[PDB]
Amino acid sequence: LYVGASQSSLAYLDGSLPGDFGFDPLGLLDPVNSGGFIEPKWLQYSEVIHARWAMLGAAGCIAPEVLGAAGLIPDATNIKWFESGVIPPAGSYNGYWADPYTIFFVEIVAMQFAELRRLQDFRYPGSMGQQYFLGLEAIFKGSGDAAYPGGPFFNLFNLGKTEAAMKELKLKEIKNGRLAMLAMLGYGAQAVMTGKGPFQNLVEHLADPVNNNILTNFA
């Protein structure tokens, strides 16, 4: 399908997994003599995790700038993503309730529970629905698939009632995630080149596409 397809890839890329457009030029999903992290299960799961974080990031990095322009948020906020405090050298916001290292500790303890509990379900399917976790273990039974746990909370509105409908939604999740992962690379590449915001970059490219593009930015 997509450019780069190879007879070699057609061996394992039979179109069962979401977003199988036949593109594995380096043969990473080949199940033969697979091991470590270079194996189908881990690599498909990692594409979805990267994709979901990238979809939230592509929106989070472009939201404040747009809303600030619309006047829906105070200018105090409306800061550039790289200037939020993730990279102090590039800038940092001093208006948070606490300092970044204090909030970062809160992040560590929160993520460790979220990540290590997500990991345990990939390692021991169904394990997070057994030991007591304040009654929440009822919603962490998961399914046989790590990337698609579903259940009372992760699939609150029970969307994807049929196998076909769920398959389509899984295709749309991977498509939007792959696009957002590419946008997040763009945001970083365009922040190093112009030192401006992604929204600003778009506004300039519309104000004058010729004098406002990568070839002009080089100078």
């Binding site: 780069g4 397809a5 070699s8 890839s9």
Partner: protein, 84 residues
Amino acid sequence: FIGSSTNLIMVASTTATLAAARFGLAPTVKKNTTAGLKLVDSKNSAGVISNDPAGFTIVDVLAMGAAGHGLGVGIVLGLKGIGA
């Protein structure tokens, strides 16, 4: 820069390489030269598929692009070096 000597040289160089491979005037991913400097059927392993009539895969473009870039760079800097 557009239409400048450097730009024209670079465009022509890369274009010439792509064209040479596209028309069997150069080695390709499916055409390899013999010790006698010939051009026979190669056996690519990955075997990228190409709808192109001459089976010009993306790898062929990448190769020609590099070759042409190198050629253009050498010619441009070389002319600058020889004053021309």
